Amino acid sequence: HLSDMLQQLHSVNASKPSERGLVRQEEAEDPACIPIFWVSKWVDYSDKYGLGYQLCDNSVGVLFNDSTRLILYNDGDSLQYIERDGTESYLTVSSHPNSLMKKITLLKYFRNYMSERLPYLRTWFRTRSAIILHLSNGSVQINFFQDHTKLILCPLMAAVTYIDEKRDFRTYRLSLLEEYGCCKELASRLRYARTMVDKLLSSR
């Protein structure tokens, strides 16, 4: 949930992780918390059709402007269609689901554009600082525009994954992180994320 998460975030922040006598952020790491999913790439052509995104497993998905979303698996043929209400259909690029060929061409453009158990995007939204991606499996991912750093948050393991400026991958157990603290920068991203999660529950 976003409540579990919000609880965990409110918590690590309440603790002011960066105003420490000694910040031993190295110790708050945990290689077993690496989330299974995150958005490798995204494309906001939503002024026209919507947001196309690529999961780290290389499956591509587009959440259209009808709130319908087509997801092409990383094998290239399999499809998942989620209607405006959430019904889930499993078709195929070759099986030809009649009426889906316009939609399927729009996905291949997004697929081609980005390359040139599967959790889809529940919803998203940008602010001037970042784009927020809320995945069905519960993780809120926040990609910050300015310095290209990223926060992927999984409420299932109370874990925060932080891809930084140099492009290094680092996963922290939010609460260990609440024992050892972390540098300013990550501590402020968790505050931002906190605000972002509130909102995912507010406007939701």
């Binding site: 490798s40 995204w42 494309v43």
Partner: peptide, 7 residues
């Protein structure tokens, strides 16, 4: 404006 940054 914008998309992911890849490449």
């Amino acid at each position: 404006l914008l998309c992911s940054t890849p490449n």
